Design an enzyme around this catalytic site. Sequence first.
Site, PDB file in Angstrom:
ATOM      1  N   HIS A  62     -25.150 -99.835  -3.919  1.00  0.00           N
ATOM      2  CA  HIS A  62     -25.255 -99.345  -5.308  1.00  0.00           C
ATOM      3  C   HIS A  62     -26.705 -99.247  -5.754  1.00  0.00           C
ATOM      4  CE1 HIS A  62     -20.963 -99.758  -5.427  1.00  0.00           C
ATOM      5  NE2 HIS A  62     -21.034-101.054  -5.173  1.00  0.00           N
ATOM      6  N   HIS A  92     -33.285-105.247  -9.910  1.00  0.00           N
ATOM      7  CA  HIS A  92     -32.924-104.059  -9.272  1.00  0.00           C
ATOM      8  C   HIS A  92     -33.271-102.900 -10.158  1.00  0.00           C
ATOM      9  CE1 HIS A  92     -29.594-104.852 -11.932  1.00  0.00           C
ATOM     10  NE2 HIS A  92     -29.465-103.536 -11.979  1.00  0.00           N
ATOM     11  N   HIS A  94     -32.218 -98.646 -11.400  1.00  0.00           N
ATOM     12  CA  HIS A  94     -31.385 -97.426 -11.420  1.00  0.00           C
ATOM     13  C   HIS A  94     -32.272 -96.242 -11.512  1.00  0.00           C
ATOM     14  CE1 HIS A  94     -27.786 -99.959 -12.597  1.00  0.00           C
ATOM     15  NE2 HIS A  94     -28.795-100.756 -12.995  1.00  0.00           N
ATOM     16  N   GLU A 104     -30.705 -95.829 -17.637  1.00  0.00           N
ATOM     17  CA  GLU A 104     -29.322 -96.110 -18.258  1.00  0.00           C
ATOM     18  C   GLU A 104     -29.402 -96.066 -19.784  1.00  0.00           C
ATOM     19  OE1 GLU A 104     -27.800 -99.564 -15.845  1.00  0.00           O
ATOM     20  OE2 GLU A 104     -26.672 -97.825 -15.122  1.00  0.00           O
ATOM     21  N   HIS A 117     -34.087-103.639 -14.082  1.00  0.00           N
ATOM     22  CA  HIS A 117     -33.315-104.713 -14.706  1.00  0.00           C
ATOM     23  C   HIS A 117     -33.618-106.004 -14.041  1.00  0.00           C
ATOM     24  CE1 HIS A 117     -30.058-101.628 -16.056  1.00  0.00           C
ATOM     25  NE2 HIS A 117     -31.119-101.654 -16.859  1.00  0.00           N
ATOM     26  N   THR A 196     -23.651-102.886 -16.440  1.00  0.00           N
ATOM     27  CA  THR A 196     -23.551-101.425 -16.412  1.00  0.00           C
ATOM     28  C   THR A 196     -22.875-100.934 -15.137  1.00  0.00           C
ATOM     29  OG1 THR A 196     -25.752-101.204 -15.455  1.00  0.00           O
ATOM     30  CG2 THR A 196     -25.636-101.096 -17.916  1.00  0.00           C
ATOM     31  N   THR A 197     -22.378-101.872 -14.331  1.00  0.00           N
ATOM     32  CA  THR A 197     -21.530-101.507 -13.143  1.00  0.00           C
ATOM     33  C   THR A 197     -20.310-102.398 -13.234  1.00  0.00           C
ATOM     34  OG1 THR A 197     -22.792-103.201 -11.855  1.00  0.00           O
ATOM     35  CG2 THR A 197     -23.370-100.840 -11.577  1.00  0.00           C
TER      36      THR A 197
HETATM   37  C1  LIG Z   1     -27.187-104.265 -15.708  1.00  0.00           C
HETATM   38  N1  LIG Z   1     -27.367-103.788 -14.311  1.00  0.00           N
HETATM   39  S1  LIG Z   1     -26.065-103.956 -13.333  1.00  0.00           S
HETATM   40  O1  LIG Z   1     -24.756-104.021 -14.038  1.00  0.00           O
HETATM   41  O2  LIG Z   1     -26.114-102.939 -12.290  1.00  0.00           O
HETATM   42  C2  LIG Z   1     -26.248-105.508 -12.483  1.00  0.00           C
HETATM   43  C3  LIG Z   1     -26.562-105.665 -11.143  1.00  0.00           C
HETATM   44  F1  LIG Z   1     -26.767-104.601 -10.325  1.00  0.00           F
HETATM   45  C4  LIG Z   1     -26.739-106.909 -10.620  1.00  0.00           C
HETATM   46  F2  LIG Z   1     -27.050-106.917  -9.229  1.00  0.00           F
HETATM   47  C5  LIG Z   1     -26.604-108.074 -11.271  1.00  0.00           C
HETATM   48  S2  LIG Z   1     -26.917-109.690 -10.583  1.00  0.00           S
HETATM   49  C6  LIG Z   1     -25.943-109.690  -9.067  1.00  0.00           C
HETATM   50  C7  LIG Z   1     -25.969-111.167  -8.672  1.00  0.00           C
HETATM   51  O3  LIG Z   1     -27.074-111.460  -7.920  1.00  0.00           O
HETATM   52  C8  LIG Z   1     -26.266-107.934 -12.587  1.00  0.00           C
HETATM   53  F3  LIG Z   1     -26.182-109.048 -13.361  1.00  0.00           F
HETATM   54  C9  LIG Z   1     -26.221-106.718 -13.148  1.00  0.00           C
HETATM   55  F4  LIG Z   1     -25.944-106.685 -14.497  1.00  0.00           F
HETATM   56 ZN   LIG Z   2     -28.772-102.665 -13.624  1.00  0.00          ZN
END
Ligand SMILES: CNS(=O)(=O)c1c(F)c(F)c(SCCO)c(F)c1F
Ligand SMILES: [Zn+2]
Length: 258
Positions: A62, A92, A94, A104, A117, A196-197
């Site tokens: 992703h 990470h 996007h 986003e 993020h 956001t995923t």
């Molecule tokens: C807000 N961005 S997100 O939903 O894509 C997203 C994500 F990609 C992550 F990897 C993690 S932490 C995974 C545990 O290590 C997370 F909290 C996130 F919110």
């Molecule tokens: Zn994210």
Amino acid sequence: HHWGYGKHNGPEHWHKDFPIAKGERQSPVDIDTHTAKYDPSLKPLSVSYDQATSLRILNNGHAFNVEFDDSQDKAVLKGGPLDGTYRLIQFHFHWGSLDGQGSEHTVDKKKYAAELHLVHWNTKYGDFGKAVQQPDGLAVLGIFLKVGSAKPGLQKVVDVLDSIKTKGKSADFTNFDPRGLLPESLDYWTYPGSLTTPPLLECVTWIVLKEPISVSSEQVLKFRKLNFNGEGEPEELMVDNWRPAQPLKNRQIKASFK
Ligand SMILES: CNS(=O)(=O)c1c(F)c(F)c(SCCO)c(F)c1F
Ligand SMILES: [Zn+2]
Ligand code: NA
Ligand code: NA
Ligand code: NA
């Protein structure tokens, strides 16, 4: 047939497996800068990254993810709108297929080329998996990327990407200093929202910095050479791994400034 970012499994599909997609506090959102409320009671953000320990970089199919040792209070976020202490677990990004899209969150409908993020979890809940089940479990620091001059503090990350091209690849990634990814100002917007995923959990206090960082065209081009597929499965470039803005519903965005 798992979730992803295409025609048949992208964001508009996610609600069938994760009905909270249509919930009351989903993210991202458009930040309409003129209706964001200045709150002079908001504290400066405290970002204390001196003792950060990065461990690994990972392609999960992703995004790519830089993970940190979060087994002690090394790298923490506090202050700002937060009560208590949130520990950095990973970051990470996007990003887009083109420099005109990829963030986003948007600012007055403006899309940036990418969005960083930095994910932190409330240490009152003892670890990340317990924290995501709580309304105040995470604090995600969001930083926009624009294409312009290179971000030198980003280059270590860019240079290791070719070693994790495909889904399920990692690499050791030690001694990476995430202070190199921050802009000069910590002026921010804040609101209650979600991952956001999938699983789209409504556990996030969002803190979005007003000032973008700039990265070069060459650095973002290298993000777009990653693959959504695994090694030896057919090539699908990892681009456009962003969720569009979702309805603000009954929320107010607060500004720390102006
Ligand atoms: C807000 N961005 S997100 O939903 O894509 C997203 C994500 F990609 C992550 F990897 C993690 S932490 C995974 C545990 O290590 C997370 F909290 C996130 F919110
Ligand atoms: Zn994210
Ligand atoms: Na490389
Ligand atoms: Na350039
Ligand atoms: Na093959």
